[PDB]
């Protein structure tokens, strides 16, 4: 299979080269954004609008943290494995927690963006006109959000081309799929309104999804699965969640198979799963139902 080997090696080299040469461009764009728009706000001479003064941390988030992570550590690691594309996933395992900063960044994106269109006015447009930059401020700001969702695609491409070392690539792919999932979960949780308790008191969020719930007719209840609770919340008009009820996971129990529909499963509380007090939830697909069953059972096992 000479053709197979040729295609595999050529595509692998192309993917690794793109992985390095786009990381370099991302670092360059972050540096330009820091040295062009942020610098005017911090150590500039122009008249800052009254509504955006002393608020550069809100607008730019922790972009400086991301830059100092990529510019000093991550790129040097990605350049080490340029001749060994099969092990690049390892670089995504050692610094797995270091990407948690991205989870922060997206959470600040709705806060920052509105501010630019609420009090900045024509400040950054005038800065771009004076500096003669092609990109606007939002074009630079959106870049980490795009970049966190590009590693998974490259890892998937490298997954189908490697014959050995598939485990390392698979682990890196799992990490780089988990990170955007947590970023989306945090943005969903940020709209939870009315919770009369402490968010951190419930542990970490694990899953969130919208279901049809029959209260012991089907009513929509977005569910949040924390390590110590399950929160049923209604969704009302924007997209804000109203805290409706919670169930302690230790007392929770699951019925996996419910007759009449393959997408329904039951949750109950108390020692005895007595009838007429069963919360019936209809998943959107078989895969969603199975994943929710597995995660809920894992939570229950953890609590005991």
């Amino acid at each position: 299979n000479a053709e197979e080997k040729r295609k595999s090696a050529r595509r692998k080299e192309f993917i690794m080269a793109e992985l390095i040469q786009t990381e370099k461009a991302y670092v360059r764009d972050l540096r330009e954004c820091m040295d062009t728009y942020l610098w005017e706000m911090t150590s500039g001479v122009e008249e800052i609008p009254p509504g955006i003064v002393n608020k550069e941390l809100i607008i730019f988030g922790n972009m400086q943290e991301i830059y100092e992570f990529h510019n000093n550590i991550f790129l040097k690691e990605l350049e080490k494995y340029e001749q060994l594309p099969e092990d690049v996933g390892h670089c995504f395992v050692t610094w797995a927690d270091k990407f948690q900063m991205y989870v922060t960044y997206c959470k600040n994106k709705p806060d920052s963006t509105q501010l630019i269109l609420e009090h900045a006015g024509s400040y950054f447009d005038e800065i771009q006109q004076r500096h003669g930059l092609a990109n606007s401020i939002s074009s630079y700001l959106i870049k980490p959000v795009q970049r966190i969702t590009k590693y998974q695609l490259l890892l998937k491409e490298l997954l189908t081309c490697c014959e050995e070392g598939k485990g390392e690539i698979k682990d890196g792919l799992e990490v780089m799929l988990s990170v955007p999932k947590r970023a989306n979960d945090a943005m969903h949780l940020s709209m939870l309104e009315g919770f009369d308790e402490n968010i951190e008191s419930q542990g970490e969020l694990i899953l969130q999804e919208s279901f049809q719930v029959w209260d012991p007719k089907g009513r929509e209840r977005h569910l949040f699965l924390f390590e110590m609770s399950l929160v049923f919340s209604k969704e009302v008009k924007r997209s804000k969640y109203l805290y409706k009820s919670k169930l302690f996971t230790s007392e929770l129990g699951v019925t996996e198979h419910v007759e009449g529909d393959p997408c329904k499963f039951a949750l109950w509380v108390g020692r005895t799963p007595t009838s007429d007090n069963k919360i019936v939830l209809k998943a959107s697909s078989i895969e969603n139902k199975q994943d929710w069953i597995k995660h809920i059972r894992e939570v229950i096992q953890e609590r005991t």
Partner: protein, 177 residues
């Protein structure tokens, strides 16, 4: 020198990244189709009215319903792209993309693009779709869906042969003007 922003939205298999690479580089990628397409901005002269067109690619943001709409605010025009050899994307156009785009941007114009025009007449794709009781999307179906979602214009393009690819962005620019 008016600045115009164009955001492409579609499923993963539609082929938006290649759709943009072939337009910007004026050549099909060839052996390797790029995975990453950084935001684009260039001067385009249309009808004696030069503009600065910027192109936004939303690849990799399909399975993230909250990270995805971060690029929607302040968008001049949308390109809702589907594939002509995959009716699933054609249904997701009216199921997923149009409701979200019209919810976040109630007044932004939309152009309905159908990609992979070159594979429509292939005798292998047709057989593979027949094995699953599927047929390629014809032009009248695309036109009907474009009239359904109130899109400004329905267009078909092919990144491999660049047939109709230059007209898509010109029509998108002309929609704003």
């Amino acid at each position: 020198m008016q600045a115009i922003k164009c955001v492409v939205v579609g499923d993963g298999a539609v082929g938006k990244t290649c759709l943009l690479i072939s337009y910007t580089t004026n050549a099909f990628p060839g052996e390797y189709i790029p995975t990453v397409f950084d935001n684009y901005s260039a001067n385009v002269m249309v009808d004696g009215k030069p503009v600065n067109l910027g192109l936004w690619d939303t690849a990799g943001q399909e399975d993230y319903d909250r990270l995805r709409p971060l690029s929607y605010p302040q968008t001049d025009v949308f390109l809702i792209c589907f594939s002509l050899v995959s009716p699933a994307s054609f249904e997701n156009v009216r199921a997923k993309w149009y409701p979200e785009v019209r919810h976040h941007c109630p007044n932004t114009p939309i152009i309905l693009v159908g990609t992979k025009l070159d594979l429509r007449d292939d005798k292998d794709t047709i057989e593979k779709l027949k094995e699953k009781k599927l047929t390629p999307i014809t032009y009248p179906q695309g036109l009907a869906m474009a009239k359904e979602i109130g899109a400004v214009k329905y267009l078909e393009c092919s990144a491999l042969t660049q047939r109709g690819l230059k007209t898509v962005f010109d029509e998108a620019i002309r929609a704003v003007l």
